[PDB]
Amino acid sequence: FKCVNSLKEDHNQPLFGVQFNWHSKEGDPLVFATVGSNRVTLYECHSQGEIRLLQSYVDADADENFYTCAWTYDSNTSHPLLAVAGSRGIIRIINPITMQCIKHYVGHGNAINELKFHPRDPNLLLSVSKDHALRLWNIQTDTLVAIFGGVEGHRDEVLSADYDLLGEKIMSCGMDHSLKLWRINSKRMMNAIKESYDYNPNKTNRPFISQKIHFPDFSTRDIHRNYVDCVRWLGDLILSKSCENAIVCWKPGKMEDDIDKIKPSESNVTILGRFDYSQCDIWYMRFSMDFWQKMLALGNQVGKLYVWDLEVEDPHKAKCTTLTHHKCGAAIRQTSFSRDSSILIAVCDDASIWRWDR
Numbered sequence: 001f002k003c004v005n006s007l008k009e010d011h012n013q014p015l016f017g018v019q020f021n022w023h024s025k026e027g028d029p030l031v032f033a034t035v036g037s038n039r040v041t042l043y044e045c046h047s048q049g050e051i052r053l054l055q056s057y058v059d060a061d062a063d064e065n066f067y068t069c070a071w072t073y074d075s076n077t078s079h080p081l082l083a084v085a086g087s088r089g090i091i092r093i094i095n096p097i098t099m100q101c102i103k104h105y106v107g108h109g110n111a112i113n114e115l116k117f118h119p120r121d122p123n124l125l126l127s128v129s130k131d132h133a134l135r136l137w138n139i140q141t142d143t144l145v146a147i148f149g150g151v152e153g154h155r156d157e158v159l160s161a162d163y164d165l166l167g168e169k170i171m172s173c174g175m176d177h178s179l180k181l182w183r184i185n186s187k188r189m190m191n192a193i194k195e196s197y198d199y200n201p202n203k204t205n206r207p208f209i210s211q212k213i214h215f216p217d218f219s220t221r222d223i224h225r226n227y228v229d230c231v232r233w234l235g236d237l238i239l240s241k242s243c244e245n246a247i248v249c250w251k252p253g254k255m256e257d258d259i260d261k262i263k264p265s266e267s268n269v270t271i272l273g274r275f276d277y278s279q280c281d282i283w284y285m286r287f288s289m290d291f292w293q294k295m296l297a298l299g300n301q302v303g304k305l306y307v308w309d310l311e312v313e314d315p316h317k318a319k320c321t322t323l324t325h326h327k328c329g330a331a332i333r334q335t336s337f338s339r340d341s342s343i344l345i346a347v348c349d350d351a352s353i354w355r356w357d358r
């Protein structure tokens with residue numbers, strides 16, 4: 001990787017999120033979105049390092065702070081869609097062509113810290129909230145499918161979550177130091193999703209009933225000792241970090257325990273490795289993976305990038321490379337790989353954007 005360009009957005013506030021559109025059509029240039037201040041902005045990557053500015057969506061409320069975005073597509077038309085959310089607790093579905101807000105969703109109106117789309121169903125959107133809950137939405141029928149919370153749910157802000165490969169289960173994490181597993185391939189949850197697709201408010205009198213899921217299928221506070229701010233599945237294993245200069249690779253149960261036989265009472269975890277780094281001990285810093293999950297990237301609070309090659313026989317054998325540029329000194333909140341892995345974008349607390357090309 002070599003650094004080929006940078007720019008800075010005019011708001012001078014942190015960019016909290018960046019995502020390449022992995023649903024961009026064949027023959028179209030690569031496009032990524034950034035979120036920070038009260039806006040979302042799209043850029044196109046071109047040759048000779050050019051980052052071409054397209055168009056932003058700017059919230060009507062100057063006090064909105066967007067924290068997260070996620071791409072999907074319209075399941076009928078195939079056209080890409082961009083979901084954004086933040087401090088106002090409003091999910092907006094944006095048409096990236098025109099930057100029009102097509103529609104929006106509100107739960108209880110508390111800050112949304114992350115959005116993720118289901119890996120097999122482009123209509124299923126997961127939000128994680130300052131109010132300690134996760135919410136699963138069906139953006140085809142505009143329904144809240146389920147809320148994941150309760151006293152055995154998270155007891156402080158949820159900061160991150162991730163679906164596994166097939167979208168059979170979710171791992172969430174947050175300010176309570178815990179990582180929690182929620183299965184969504186239960187008979188109850190599969191039925192709820194089916195019913196969400198059968199719901200049309202114009203053809204019935206009932207409101208749509210959301211599931212209240214009050215018990216995770218596994219919980220641990222034994223991995224980290226501070227706010228857990230990013231989580232990703234790596235097959236049946238988990239990658240997660242806190243502010244302790246480490247990403248931990250771990251699994252529920254003992255070494256030979258199958259993830260789908262784990263009981264909610266399981267008290268053990270197994271640590272398969274840990275990737276240490278420096279100067280990333282402030283709260284709220286995300287790591288990202290490429291499409292194939294061959295690579296892992298994390299930026300630190302002084303503008304250094306760490307990239308791990310996970311194409312090795314066991315997690316602890318990961319090979320680290322580091323990327324620095326003398327002008328890049330601000331905290332990197334998130335990174336994104338292009339779908340082909342040829343470009344890595346980093347975004348920063350000073351509103352700067354850094355492009356690295358293979």
Ligand SMILES: Cc1cccc(F)c1CN1C[C@H](c2ccc(-c3cnn(CC(N)=O)c3)cc2)[C@@H](N(C)C)C1
Binds near residue numbers: 016114157159333
């Ligand atoms: C990015 C991220 C990463 C991982 C998990 C996550 F959940 C999030 C999302 N975060 C948005 C919120 C937030 C974070 C930072 C600031 C802030 C203010 N000033 N600065 C530095 C400056 N230089 O201005 C930074 C303000 C609000 C955090 N919540 C819990 C308070 C969660």
